[PDB]
Amino acid sequence: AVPYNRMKLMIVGNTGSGKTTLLQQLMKMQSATVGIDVKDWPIQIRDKRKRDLVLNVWDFAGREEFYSTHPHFMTQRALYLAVYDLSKGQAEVDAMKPWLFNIKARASSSPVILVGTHLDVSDEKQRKACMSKITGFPAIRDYHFVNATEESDALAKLRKTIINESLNFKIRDQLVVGQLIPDCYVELEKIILSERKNVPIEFPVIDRKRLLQLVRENQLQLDENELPHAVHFLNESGVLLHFQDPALQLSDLYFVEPKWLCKIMAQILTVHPKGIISRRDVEKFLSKKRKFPKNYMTQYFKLEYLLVPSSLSDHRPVIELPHCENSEIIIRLYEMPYFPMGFWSRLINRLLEISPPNRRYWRQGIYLNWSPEAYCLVGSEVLDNHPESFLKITVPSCRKGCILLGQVVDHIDSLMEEWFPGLLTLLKKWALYSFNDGEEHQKILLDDLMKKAEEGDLLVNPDQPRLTIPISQIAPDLILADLPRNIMLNNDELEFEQAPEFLLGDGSFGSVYRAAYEGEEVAVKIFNKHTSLRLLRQELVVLCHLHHPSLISLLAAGIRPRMLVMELASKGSLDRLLQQDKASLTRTLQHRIALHVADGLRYLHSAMIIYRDLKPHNVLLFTLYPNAAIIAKIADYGIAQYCCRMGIKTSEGTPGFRAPEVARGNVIYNQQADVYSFGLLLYDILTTGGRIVEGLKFPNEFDELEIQGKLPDPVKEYGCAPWPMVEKLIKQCLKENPQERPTSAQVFDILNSAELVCLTRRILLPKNVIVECMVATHHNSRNASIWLGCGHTDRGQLSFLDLNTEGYTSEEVADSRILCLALVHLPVEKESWIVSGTQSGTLLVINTEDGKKRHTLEKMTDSVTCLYCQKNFLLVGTADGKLAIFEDKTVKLKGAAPLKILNIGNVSTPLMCLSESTNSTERNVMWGGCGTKIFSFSNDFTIQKLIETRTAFSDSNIITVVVDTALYIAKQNSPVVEVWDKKTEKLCGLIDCVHFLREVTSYSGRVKTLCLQKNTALWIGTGGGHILLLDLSTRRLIRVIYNFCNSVRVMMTAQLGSLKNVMLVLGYNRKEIQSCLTVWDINLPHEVQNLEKHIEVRKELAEKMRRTSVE
Ligand SMILES: CCNc1nc(Nc2cc(F)c(C(=O)N3CCOCC3)cc2OC)ncc1C(F)(F)F
Ligand SMILES: Nc1nc2c(ncn2[C@@H]2O[C@H](COP(=O)(O)OP(=O)(O)O)[C@@H](O)[C@H]2O)c(=O)[nH]1
């Protein structure tokens, strides 16, 4: 709680007025001030206990050219002077009036002194009357007309004033110098002083990390929670500058020397018509520790062939209207008292769109000429013999000019709705009509012409009814004549009813009743009585130009009852289907309704439009049939506003579905503040809308989640089944730093995957415990438990992961490394038993239910390499290839050998690829291999086929075999898989692995696992971490799957929750190993096709719509 006494002064001094001269004479070569020039000014008041008053003084430059960049520095908590000469007379105060008017809106809680200058040649008696009449214009406390350069002025009353304002001037009833601010704040300021000396001279900036390091490094005791509050406070007193604005993206940097930013305009001013200059090559001529000075972020200065408005000429150029007649041209008018500082800059910027041409943009008017058919001379014409100012648009009275005027007036009214609120009141529109051509123009304000037209669009001369002028060619914005002629109401062919029964939703400003239009069914959106035409145009700027097959469409629009006919969504909104038909949302439809909305948002954000209102009641469905082309459109663009790279300043949003910065409306967000609403939609789709009704209880609890943002784990509490690939969106596109969210194209891309609609679970075993052999549970009904054979320790462990609970309940039952496992499921006597094959060569046996039933079978001659489980025959393969046959009747027997060894090889030949077939169900076609030699056998235990494979990678032993109609053979470190036919016993195909991997990439394209789906496709798992979804048919590649693992160890097919079709996968993360277990849904090969055909369908739809729309 330390005292802090340092206020800021802003002498806004016009040119020639001697603001610098008065400051110099007050604070005890003066060519001009090129921009702001900040100084300090210490003083000690006469009172003994008077706080040390030091005024951070800004000697604001006053040439008109600089004005466009001024308002961004005029902030609150500052006493604005004003300086106008008196040798000019009553004209000088009139010329100073715009400055006071601009102060009146940029900061109106700031006291304003007002001081003349150069009283040596003044006539005070005249100007005193109008100066008193000045006291809309803010609280000009006290005029203090004073001398020029000598010392005969009591203007030091400023000090007096401010020390009164030390407690009179009250930001929220506080004291500007008496704020009991913590000592950590002042310590931050103290270290900022030295940081300004340490920071590069021509590159003043510090990052966040350095600030966070020095906070604790110098024992400040400052917490990270109040740290942004501390930054904001110091920015208020003006010792540093920080731009929280997400649209600017400069939230990372911190500016320590505010004396530098003020002069960047001056420097860049003097780095063919102006506003055209070469690339900003001067960005590297300085220190510039980046590819720009002080960071790469200079070019984001909202104050590359260059355009700058400040240096634009101030004379109306030599441009003549192609036509001249009262009948042939419309002219709109806006009556405004004072052009806000920085208007024409924003206007030129916004009107540098060329998609609604020889230009001629001067400092106070754009000009856009396509041809003698259509031009739009937006320009300032104060020549009215009146004090106020007129902004006038001029267009030719043909339909092309109407389509131009009706868009220019929307863009101007969006400028004046987002950036300049104070004007709208002061703003007063006008339309210029004339009955008999040649006579002068007669004006009528717009609020009256709108009603005169609503009554009837045949505007009558009040003097004599013999003259008639249609409201079309005088003001076609009001009667909706500037619209493509395909969309126009035809009320004869419309039969709506406003009755209660025929009602649908009620989306905020309006209602939507169903009706008939041409014979089909439609959704007539008649507006309320208290609704302005501006909202109609705000929706008809989006609904009549953009065409996309995931956005709602317009069938008509008319001004008589002010409706908007739109196509009907038969199946209902997303909310009314996420509260009733809960069980109709499968895992496919839940992804289609999130892909179509993402595509809609992509097309929106690609036309410079922000939606801002992505609720779950503005996602309409058309057909719940999971496999279609147009499932989910978007509707209710009631507050959708244009959004360039500059950003938006208003704050509209339904409480609970807003970005974190939208709620704190002080900052200016951008298009990427919408992806948060989409993430919230995705969180409300994943959990079947539980959050909706939970937020319905309390509006404060509904809005805290967009302010506090403590969202639960959706899989834990709400009960939803795990979707472990979309939970990487919901946990990514819900962040707090807007720069770190995925862009809309990048969240459409992540959602345009067949993996996401598949990876169905994902488990990570504990740190550095590894699996080498997996076996599922054949019961599939007791629970979802999958025993795993560990291999990390020298001894052998037998873990048992339980899939639904994720509890790794390992155990140590083996002495040596565990190599193979198998589950014998005999309903006879309820004998479900798991046996294993150790690297030592013993067949350990364990019962699932019995905690201790270790009936260790008679150990084989050598180690164990594989095992296989109607026919309940156990076929054990040793490293010698001495295949053994046990039996299921000896499950209780503790050590035995039921049948004889069918030895087919020696110790040199390792035998582990045993497999059966799904063709004809006859186990007699069991295949396999002993060493570098394939073989088969049957129940007769005879070798009915031995096919040696001795014919660089062609000299390796066998690993896996699968048999549906041919043979597939993998061998150790083989980029190929040697195919064989079971009829000719000859090698037919050679499916090269790395050849296929060449599209995604001493190549580690190994083959460490292999599986074969029933009759659809292969799953070839590569030791490099890829899953080759090879098509079984002839050669086609469905998809290669990667970027989730580093080495796939084992793969197999299992069953979960009494339903089949899951594909377990056990993978390495390569000495730190994180053994991972994905569980795919084996519908994946048919999915990659169905999804790709769907996408390719609607992309054709989107192109047929957009291309034809140009006509
Ligand atoms: C904001 C909703 N607007 C629309 N809504 C619809 N369709 C429906 C919306 C619904 F919600 C329900 C519904 O389930 N209801 C239950 C009772 O309460 C409301 C009606 C039924 C719909 O069509 C049959 N079509 C077009 C529109 C658009 F405005 F976009 F044109
Ligand atoms: N009329 C008049 N002008 C003065 C007097 N003393 C200084 N000036 C002018 O006032 C100017 C300073 O005005 P300033 O606010 O810095 O103008 P800016 O640089 O364009 O913003 C100097 O350039 C002087 O030429 C004076 O006694 N009478």
Numbering used by the authors: 1329 to 1356, 1364 to 1470, 1478 to 1613, 1621 to 1652, 1665 to 1717, 1729 to 1796, 1806 to 2250, 2259 to 2340, ...
From the paper:
Second, the binding of type I inhibitors could lead to a kinase-closed active-like conformation with flexible N-terminal ARM-ANK-LRR domains, which did not show interaction with the rest of the protein upon activation. We determined LRRK2RCKWm structures with LRRK2-IN-1 and GNE-7915 at overall resolutions of 3.5 and 3.8 Å, respectively. LRRK2 with type 1 inhibitors bound show conformational differences compared to the active LRRK2cent protomer in the Rab29–LRRK2 complex with a small rotational movement of ROC-COR domains. The differences likely result from the tetramerization of LRRK2 in the Rab29–LRRK2 complex, where ROC-COR domains play a key role in mediating LRRK2 oligomerization.
Leucine-rich repeat kinase 2 (LRRK2) is a highly pursued drug target for Parkinson’s disease (PD), which is the second most common neurodegenerative disease projected to affect 17.5 million people by 20401. LRRK2 is a 286-kDa protein containing seven domains (ARM, ANK, LRR, ROC, COR, KIN, and WD40) with kinase and GTPase activities. Autosomal dominant LRRK2 mutations with higher kinase activity are leading genetic causes of both familial and sporadic late-onset PD cases. Here we report high-resolution cryo-EM structures of LRRK2 in complex with a panel of small molecules, including two type I (LRRK2-IN-1 and GNE-7915) and three type II inhibitors (rebastinib, ponatinib, and GZD-824).
